[PDB]
Amino acid sequence: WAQSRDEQNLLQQKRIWESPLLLAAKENNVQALYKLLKFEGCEVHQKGAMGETALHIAALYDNNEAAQVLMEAAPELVFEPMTSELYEGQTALHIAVINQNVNLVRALLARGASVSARATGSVFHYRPHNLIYYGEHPLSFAACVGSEEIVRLLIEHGADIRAQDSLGNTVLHILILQPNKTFACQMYNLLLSYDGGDHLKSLELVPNNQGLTPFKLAGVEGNIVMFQHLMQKRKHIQWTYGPLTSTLYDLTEIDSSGDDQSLLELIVTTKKREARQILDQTPVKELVSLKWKRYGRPYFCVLGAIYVLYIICFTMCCVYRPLKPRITNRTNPRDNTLLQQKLLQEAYVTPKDDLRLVGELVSIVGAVIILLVEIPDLGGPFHVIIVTYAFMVLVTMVMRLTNSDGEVVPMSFALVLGWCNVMYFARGFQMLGPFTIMIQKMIFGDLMRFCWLMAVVILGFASAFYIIFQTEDPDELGHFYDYPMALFSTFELFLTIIDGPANYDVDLPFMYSITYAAFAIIATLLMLNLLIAMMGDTHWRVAHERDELWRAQVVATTVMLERKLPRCLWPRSGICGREYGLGDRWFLRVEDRQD
Ligand SMILES: C[C@@H]1NC(=O)N[C@@H]1CCCCCC(=O)O
Ligand SMILES: [Ca+2]
């Protein structure tokens, strides 16, 4: 697709060269325009490759003199849009506004150029392959280029500030997506000066297509300067006492009032890393910290202690499995067999089997409660593991009443997944909070690397060892008696967790010694190169990323507890302004001291 516009831009230059009229508009050749327009009559309404006219070209390459000749000879060219799909709807005013040719913009508005002309072409879409997004209407173009002179000039000729684009963005929504945050604030206020001024139907209230007010969209995008600027409109200073200043905050669009209306709801769910810095701002960080000091952290430990006991209950039923002898003399055929099956679905006969029964009941009513609170739909795996555990418990009860060969298989998965999910609660316990994020974040980046290389390394060394020792006999060495043991023993050899094959009475093959020396070296190199390469995440910037991602996890977990738990506990944050002076809204008291 990108080659098409590359072809079309190259094609347009060819059509500009071929057409002697369009070339004069590109090169500002006033002398040639008069000879073509007047003496040797040429098609003045000439359409170019991009469906453009000579006036579109005269505005692209800032040539006011050539543009004025075309308008004095054919003033209807001003209203003509670009017919091409890439530039559907663009007019010569859009081009003159974005190039800040005020004299051409002034002269174009004299011809009555439509200020409501929408530029709906594909190069004007809010897409990553487009380098800018200024909206559709010419007023938003002037707002994004920072030309305040053209902005008021377009308003004077009847520009509507409430104009929404394809994505329902008002001119305020578009300014927040612009890079220059420090200069767009002054431009932002200039547009609000032409607002209706009434307390209702303010332009700051018109939401996005995704249901986002300009204030709320600024927080999601991570725009700090606009979020700070928009905050002045909703904070009220109570009094000034020396260095102390007590400020009251409106807290309306920030708190979790509506189901999805909450701004905090949007900050924890969005993918932008810059949005993490919004909960550090001075309306939010005081709020989210008060929600964690009281009603947040204490309930998390309560739910933590409950889940830990529930796992101990399930763990106790797994250590006290049904017990039974082997009931078969199968142990001698394939004499390596070591099993003593213990499965028997006795009716009751319970001196203490009823004790583990209610534990199997707690585990069932627990796994079904777990499965009925998460499936009715950062903390990713630690919430996908619990449902996998609850799945295993229900499958284990289906392994019961069927008592298949692998009774331990789905039950063993529930033990590791049940305990390794207890360190989910690490996110709210100070010391190991960021630590769990550390072990969680590398499982993707620094684990898949060196794992695909460890796996590929053993498939060369493990397969060698089997060749060296299927000629020998499994009786004395036996580390590589079949192929699966060759892979599994060498894997353990890679981590040095087993002792390394060594038999000094017998004589080992002369190929084992050379291969293992190379294995012992390579296994240490890739092991040391896992350590020092995984060490790069120790920059003092990561010192924030270790911590400020843990604070983000605490804030994200704080939002989780308040949504599901009833309103009887965890009252609404702040103080309701009703029964005070500020009508039925909730406010937060924050006082500071400036040095
Ligand atoms: C230069 C082209 N010639 C023309 O007459 N209009 C085009 C303007 C190019 C703007 C592309 C904006 C974008 O990347 O979306
Ligand atoms: Ca050892």
Author numbering: 29 to 405, 420 to 637
Quote what the paper states about this structure:
TRPV6 and its close relative TRPV5 are TRP channels that are distinctly Ca2+-selective and play an important role in calcium homeostasis. Structurally, TRP channels are assemblies of four identical subunits arranged symmetrically around the pore axis. The transmembrane domain of TRP channels includes six transmembrane helices (S1–S6) and a pore loop (P-loop) between S5 and S6. S5, P-loop and S6 form the KcsA channel-like pore domain, with the ion conduction pathway lined by the S6 helices and extracellular loops connecting the P-loop helix to S5 and S6.
TRPV6* crystallized in a nearly identical crystal lattice to TRPV6cryst and the overall shape of the molecule was very similar. Despite these similarities, to our great surprise, the structure of TRPV6* exhibited the domain swapped fold observed in other TRP channels of known structure. Similarly, both the 2Fo-Fc and robust Fo-Fc omit maps for TRPV6* demonstrated completely different connectivity of transmembrane domains compared to TRPV6cryst. In TRPV6*, L495 projects its side chain into a hydrophobic pocket formed by residues of S5 and S6 of one subunit and residues at the S4–S5 elbow of the adjacent subunit. By contrast, in TRPV6cryst, Q495 is rotated by ~120° with respect to the orientation of L495 in TRPV6* and forms polar interactions with the hydrophilic pocket formed by S4–S6 and the TRP helix of the same subunit. Despite these gross similarities, kinetic analysis indicated the rate of increase in Fura-2 signal is faster in TRPV6* compared to TRPV6cryst.
